[PDB]
Amino acid sequence: HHMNIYDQLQAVEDRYEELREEANSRETVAVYREYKQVVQNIADAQEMPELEEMAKEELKNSKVAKEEYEEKLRFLLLPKDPNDDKNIILEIRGAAGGDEAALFAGDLLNMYQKYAENQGWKFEVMEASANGVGGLKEVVAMVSGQSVYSKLKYESGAHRVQRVPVTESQGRVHTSTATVLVMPEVEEVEYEIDPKDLRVDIYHAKVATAVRIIHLPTNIKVEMQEERTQQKNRDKAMKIIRARVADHFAQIAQDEQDATVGTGDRSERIRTYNFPQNRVTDHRIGLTLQKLDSILSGKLDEVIDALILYDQTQKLEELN
């Protein structure tokens, strides 16, 4: 089968019309079907006094969209990370910088919360830990919807802020860091953990309802107390340990297979947010945009689509 991109996509659509792998195809067929609609629209415009000038504009517009879709299509048939279509657990922690680092963690949380709104996703904050002066020591959230990991997977790492603290009178720019970790949601079914490998402490932050679970082989610990029942706190804690433990080991297995955009090191500064310059830079793909205001407000697609494209270009080239 020495078949080209269009053959492959037509083969997908035919397999789609034959058809739980229908959802796997859904997004691709709608893109190819829309590309075929554009190609018809160009043929239509070529058949259609100032109406001639009108249709010539419509043709140019159609032709330009074909170029845009052509670029889209090449990457559609790439092999997907099977986690791409998963919901994710999101964690943000103020790291270096003090109060300013906790503020920025809050800024990031707001950004993802606004982005998640934009994307039509559900954003549950599962637990969060404030510093009692407007700052976020850490937060863990779950983000759910269509292919959430496929879009947020690149947020894992150290996010540097440079800004003049509101407390600062002398115009000095303080640099801080908040860390972000994004991990796919792992179903109990998919990743079983022997209770022998768990310590579950139940304690009062009446029935004690605060729950600490420590996965003993890794010393991964989670503490949940927000909920009114032990069961609720246990279950939340367990979703998070499962994710963290599966991620722990997926990371070692990635590391064994050395010899992906960025390093894959999650302590690496991946991004810098400079307030004075209204700048966001993503250090992995040499991208700087003077759009920090709108990025922090949740308009993060331009940045994410850049990363996706960089990765897809990488993956496509190495597939030669």
Swiss-Prot record:
Indicate where this protein is primarily found: cytoplasm
GO cellular component terms?
cytoplasm
Task: Please provide the record's keywords in A-Z order.
Answer: Cytoplasm, Methylation, Protein biosynthesis
- Say yes or no: keyword Cytoplasm present: yes
* Compartment(s) of residence: Cytoplasm
Q: What are the GO MF terms of this UniProt record? A: translation release factor activity, codon specific
Family listed: Belongs to the prokaryotic/mitochondrial release factor family.
HAMAP family linked: Rel_fac_1
Function statement: Peptide chain release factor 1 directs the termination of translation in response to the peptide chain termination codons UAG and UAA.
Name listed for the protein in its UniProt record? Peptide chain release factor 1
